[model samples]
Target: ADTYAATRYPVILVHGLAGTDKFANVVDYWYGIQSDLQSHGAKVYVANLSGFQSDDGPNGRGEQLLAYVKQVLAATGATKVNLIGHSQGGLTSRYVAAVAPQLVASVTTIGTPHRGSEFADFVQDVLKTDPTGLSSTVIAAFVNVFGTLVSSSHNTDQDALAALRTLTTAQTATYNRNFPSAGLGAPGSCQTGAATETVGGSQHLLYSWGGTAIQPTSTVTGATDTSTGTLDVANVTDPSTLALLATGAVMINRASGQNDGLVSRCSSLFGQVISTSYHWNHLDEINQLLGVRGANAEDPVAVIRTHVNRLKLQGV
Candidate 1:
């Protein structure tokens, strides 16, 4: 019954956008990683952080997440917890760490855009066509609220622009304060390893992983993709601009290149590329079908356990 006798620091796993606690089990989202961790004597905590959900709501999902982290600390009596965030979960967890660095040991992001994405730009563009564009129905309600808050904060009426700013350099600066400037690095995919070189005098380990789907499916594709979930942007004809964009996206292929299909591999990449076998897509990274083949196909839970054991082995 020794609370602190565990091999590695307790791990808190955060899910990506549109994710819920249920998704991990709905289809083995954790990919049985939790079971794997438990078998290895590691305590794993799954964070029900909704990737599509943001803090701009009256519900304040942000505060809720921070509270959850605090609860984990109190309940376990662990001095700090390792944070493994997937997709938008990465940003949500980053917010928590920034707000309370003392409660965290290390922060790892899977397919997070520390920098903004071209898609954000695209979303903003779509919104501009009609203040009451098609998005009012397509996008999440809170995102609309986030758009309004960000827009008004910047003394502008454009919500998309505000959202973009909040996600880019502005928000990045705010985040760096809690994390340390030295830890922050140039933005791109995990393959851009040199860019993630340790910052802020702290060896706060930062890592990233990504994947490309053989074909897309409803649980994983974009609205524009066909039945197979393939945008097949590479094969798309006509608009020279779209073609160029698709080409750029293709050349972006690398262990760091497998994006969530929304963000680019360069953008999704973070820290050191701990994994890059190219399994999960965007949502797939969150907790695909409970990970039938397993989240990263390496037993997500085992991955964290190994790291925790590494810390213990090193006497950290």
Candidate 2:
């Protein structure tokens, strides 16, 4: 008789790179997804890893998260916890599940690049090729210095470079080699794992979903000449909006024309893909841009609720 959002296990929310767990009431990393889930009888906890710089990459964060999971289990008196991570957090969650599977009931990712992002590789190549260039130097310094400063409140010894390296395709390949996807049998089936890893002799369930559009727009009017539908989602002075506009097309080109600005749809897949063509951009998948991504845009909060329900249905 439990509702869809009411899962047996409490949920832990993990944010992406350059993300935070706490913010002013007006802004939040997970936007309203946490509140939406809580409204339906779900216990949620938002993790506070380094914001701009995760020093030791996903593995480090995973170790940190394992401790946090133990804390949550102790406080909630639950045997297992569910993990919902975004971007690099997905990889972090995977590491935790792999190393400490007994503590995790399920792992769900949103717009997580399990296969790595070519965009990260492109940025790495640019920085490596032209370290003296204006843009390259600026970005490099930003990641090294500015990123650490911004994340210092949460973590001191930060390394944005290591996090970036972890996002590159080559690094993820190594990760998959060690921690293979649990459900590789059915392309879209959940609760499956490869023959490699198992938790207490049973593999934990894994699931993922993502988007493919670079920009969020409305074709209901049928005019492509001046589609300002993304205006609300990418308003003035938004750094992520500007970055997506400047580099989304290139990443799309590299990803065979199916990318959500920062990550390709294919890269977002983990175990079972709930969707790869959700028609939302990277930020849209998290319901960002001040939570006004337009009515036509997919409801990220609702999508999360539905997935939690899916987990409940599966008895996770």
Candidate 3:
């Protein structure tokens, strides 16, 4: 219970892809890990978004994150939350913060695609036309409107895409320059060199986290510790989420030089690589499947705690 009362701002954990903050068919992704943070004195909240399973209609994720953030604030009586978004959840949180900076104090993305992912490009290229597939035409059509609606809503995909593109490298420099006013595209202008940073013009902060894979070194024969802890996440099975992974526009990644199973670190270099080379593949970063703990027992719940504590030190 002590972990439930750790920091000042409420801790909100955002899930990626087919995840929904809490367990439906499985246990809460955060499970003991969340309580572990609470045990260490931290307040936590989980984001339940619509997309990855279904698009958020016209408003998409921007509105959904805002609405839920309002709810989190109301429930906790906290003015802002230290956001810990995994994968798409990272982008979703950016939408809320960009559109309603007041609702958030800081953002820390874990294995999020700050630039979008090449795998995404691959997925998009393959699934763009599929009607029943994960990134079906229906989903793609809805996202096509994301750009337009985003401009009208928070005015920059609410920094969501900024975080998303951190996963890709294609025209990143050009895209940021051409759309200076867009999302968090101003490059090194965002936060504390730690993927976590203060939003421009606001007191809010944004940070990032990524790893290689969740597989244990023991599983990787002849695997030296040299490159083991360099990636943000691992065990990323592109074959599994082939549908959703293949839904976005094709692009290149040239940022940090690493990747989750879904994104390249070079692309996710949104801020800094805290968990460098830590084995925590894509799914592990988002939510461990079958409740299997990552190789290093990398609990994202603890990752959220550490980042939130960092923000607490900022007193934003």
Candidate 4:
């Protein structure tokens, strides 16, 4: 009788570019987010698209998402599923909703680049190097930390370049034009889209939130001072992780508009636009790095728990 985050519908977590449901069949792409939702009385699952290499759908492989949702529907015997996606995953959620609104009860995006990712554009400019070098480098980094010598289960394909192309501003614009959603936060500018959209005889409750940016020189108050190799606190952030996110952060600035080391705040303003300014970075938004973050950092897991509770109140 103490259920707080119980929603009438199950929730599906979609993975972003170069990601699967889990890495090495041990580490979840969503990190600790799944069990947290389940613990709070929500049914949760992951949508794995084998790297999501294409948006080549009237909906860009939205059919794939639809297919997975159908499986979840049958498995749980639920009529509709709610989508909560991160990064490219968020884009796919919207894609599925646009193609099959009737199947989704709600949609939520976190750290998603709806407007487009500057990093993607930046990488494209540097195509003077091996085109494969960009994604290959990213994959190598993931492999180094997560120990994924191979792809996760249920994901055999790896045409990652197509996925990168999909995140570009131009490609995103094409997606917007191709799958126009009135419920979308203003695709043309940095403004929140509609909160509710009735399409294809289905009404959807939409919401989204994202984090601002990070810098290598970030002044994370209360952070450990490891400058002299003698720690002021128990933990300090990994240099590589900080550097990667900082790279993206420097490429794009979301000031009040700061980015999450990846997606910009304005680009993440979809649906009701729950928020776009969080202290978390791209990884922190998903509670990554084993849910360890700097002192005073936002609790990503708690945020989702409350949001799911909010959904419960709305009876979705």
Q: Which candidate has the top score in lDDT?
A: 4
C-alpha RMSD of candidate 2:
5.8
**TM-score, each model?**
0.60, 0.79, 0.63, 0.81
Q: Across residues 1-316, which tens digit of lDDT does each residue of candidate 2 receive?
A: 2355888999999977654563322357788888788878788898877523332344467667888899999999999998999888898888788777788888888888777787678767776777532365334433443243234344322444445667787787777778766544443332233423357775677788887656423331211211125445344533444344334555654542466666776677666678776756676777775564533457788888888888888787
C-alpha local distance difference test of each model: 0.49, 0.66, 0.51, 0.68
- What is the per-residue lDDT of model 1 for residues 247-268, given as tens digits with 9 covering 90 to 100? 2232233222334444555565
lDDT of 4 by residue, 1-316 (tens): 3478789999898888665566455667777888878877788888877544455454345667888999899888899998998888888888888877888999988888888877666656656576444454543443244333124533323333334667887788887777777656643567786888998989999888987644333543212211112341213544334534534543443232356655777778888887765666666777765666655457888898899898889889
Any runs in candidate 1 off by more than 4 Å, and if so which? Answer: 1-7, 24-31, 50-59, 130-181, 187-203, 212-258, 275-279, 290-316
Among all windows of 10 consecutive residues in model 2, the one with the lowest summed lDDT is: 219-228
* 2 or 3, greater by lDDT: 2
Cα lDDT, model 3, residue 237 = 26
Better of 1 and 4 by TM-score: 4
Could you give candidate 3's per-residue lDDT for residues 1-316 as a string of tens digits? Answer: 4433366788887766543454333456554556666677777677766543212235665477788888888877787777777766766666667667667777767766655566544434444476223354523432442222232134322222232333334533443343222224345442224334445455655566676542223221212222123341432422212212222112212122334446555445454446546555554554454444334546665665666566667674
Per-candidate Cα RMSD to the true structure, in Å, reads: 9.5, 5.8, 9.4, 4.9
Instruction: Please report the candidate that would top TM-score against the real structure.
Output: 4
User: Could you tally the backbone clashes for each prediction?
Assistant: 23, 3, 76, 9
- What order do candidates take by TM-score, descending? 4, 2, 3, 1
